[PDB]
Amino acid sequence: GTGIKVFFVTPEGREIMIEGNEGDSILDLAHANNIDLEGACEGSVACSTCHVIVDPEHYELLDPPEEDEEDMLDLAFGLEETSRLGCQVLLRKDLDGIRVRIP
Numbered sequence: 001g002t003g004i005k006v007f008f009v010t011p012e013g014r015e016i017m018i019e020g021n022e023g024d025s026i027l028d029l030a031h032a033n034n035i036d037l038e039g040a041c042e043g044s045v046a047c048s049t050c051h052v053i054v055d056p057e058h059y060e061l062l063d064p065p066e067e068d069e070e071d072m073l074d075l076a077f078g079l080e081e082t083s084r085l086g087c088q089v090l091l092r093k094d095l096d097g098i099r100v101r102i103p
């Protein structure tokens with residue numbers, strides 16, 4: 001398929017499954033579907049409002065975070081081992097079925 005499944009759990013504990021395309025960031029999908037993941041700095045790696053926690057399995061599939069993301073993540077509330085900036089995790093076909101939780 002061209003659709004890539006993304007499972008979202010919101011801070012309220014709601015669970016949503018949506019499909020994205022290659023290139024779509026988790027932040028885009030969030031906005032596209034009224035998941036309340038704010039993107040203060042609009043993808044410029046200058047905030048932490050797009051912080052999401054990805055499942056461990058798909059986490060290792062990802063291009064690891066660059067230095068600007070890592071550093072910014074240190075201001076993110078609720079940081080975990082598999083935390084990422086949602087605007088920096090972009091969908092690929094091998095990431096199908098990825099789970100993101102919004103702290």
Ligand code: FES
Pocket residue numbers: 038039040041042043044045046047048049050051085086087088
């Ligand atoms: S929107 Fe600010 S870092 Fe992703």
